[PDB]
Design a protein around this nucleic acid. Sequence first.
DNA 1: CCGACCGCGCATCAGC
DNA 2: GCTGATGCGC
DNA 3: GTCGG
Length: 326
Amino acid sequence: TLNGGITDMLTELANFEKNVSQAIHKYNAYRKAASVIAKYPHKIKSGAEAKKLPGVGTKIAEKIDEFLATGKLRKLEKIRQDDTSSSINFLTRVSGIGPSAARKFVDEGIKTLEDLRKNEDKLNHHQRIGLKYFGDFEKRIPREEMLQMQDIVLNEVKKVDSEYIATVCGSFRRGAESSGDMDVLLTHPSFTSESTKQPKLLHQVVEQLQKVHFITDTLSKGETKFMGVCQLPSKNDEKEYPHRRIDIRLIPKDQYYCGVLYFTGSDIFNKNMRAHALEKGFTINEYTIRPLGVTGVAGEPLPVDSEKDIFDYIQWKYREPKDRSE
DNA sequence: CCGACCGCGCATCAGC
DNA sequence: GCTGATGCGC
DNA sequence: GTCGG
Ligand SMILES: Nc1nc2c(ncn2[C@H]2C[C@H](O)[C@@H](COP(=O)(O)OP(=O)(O)CP(=O)(O)O)O2)c(=O)[nH]1
Ligand SMILES: [Cl-]
Ligand SMILES: [Cl-]
Ligand SMILES: [Cl-]
Ligand SMILES: [Cl-]
Ligand SMILES: [Cl-]
Ligand SMILES: [Mg+2]
Ligand code: NA
Ligand code: NA
Ligand code: NA
């Protein structure tokens, strides 16, 4: 919040480039700058001071001067007044509707929450659930509620097979007092990078969760990735809790650390760390860390027995989850 | 300059 | 049916 | 939009 004005501005510019301009790199450029400045322990007094941080170049430096001077940015004021941009931005807030779909809907006159509702026939399954819970997915989840959700999931998973290990990751694992959703890493001895000794490993869990009415909907589902909706049970006479987004990722047991590193994030932190890995000659995904051969082709998985082993490989001092919130 | 910008699962489409 | 490109998301 | 070679 120290530099909240500036970071909000950069985020708005990032989302604009992503949703309207469909310019992913400009999007990521603004995000990075926002991230670097959010972490900066001083109240920025000028663009120049900001340019000193990696990620802030000449352009963002100017915008920061304009912002610090007037408390606003013309580029944004104009964008806010543009109907197409505003429409596209709004629609992209529905889960399942990205930049393309949003622009197409607008081409059909479907630009508001009202238009989306009377045109359900024009939405795929995911987008349909996104609209249904449009308001709920906008609410944050207090950590207290994340703890109740954690307890349900672990206990339910345990009932299916005592050997399943479910680990809540994402911002929750990073210690956040509130999370946008719940992220669950799931492992089972029958599933290793070596073999899948038992089928329906993810299915059984999803099934058990739906049975106790925890999982309410399904956006998408595969052998290793589940993307849906869940809701805590409410007591007698009390207003029921909001529906929450939930992701469940089944990863080979023997590749847990690369998996938990990945799911703990943050997303930006992962991008920076993977980028750094490359510079050091490695490549990192959710399954392994491999060296980059002379020809650039990835080599064989390197042995890993902790998240720290991954950090060491790329010559980075270990960073506890709570400090990976970039 | 100017090329790189992390890496991957699922849903959906077009071409065969 | 399949493979691959594209959208969307984590 | 920013950066490093
Ligand atoms: N390499 C990558 N990894 C990624 C990426 N997007 C997401 N992720 C990883 C890291 C996230 O923590 C994790 C969960 O995804 P989530 O969106 O839930 O992020 P949280 O950190 O939990 C913030 P919250 O608002 O939900 O509290 O998935 C990506 O582009 N590239
Ligand atoms: Cl771009
Ligand atoms: Cl503004
Ligand atoms: Cl691992
Ligand atoms: Cl791999
Ligand atoms: Cl921590
Ligand atoms: Mg999350
Ligand atoms: Na800079
Ligand atoms: Na969306
Ligand atoms: Na998530």
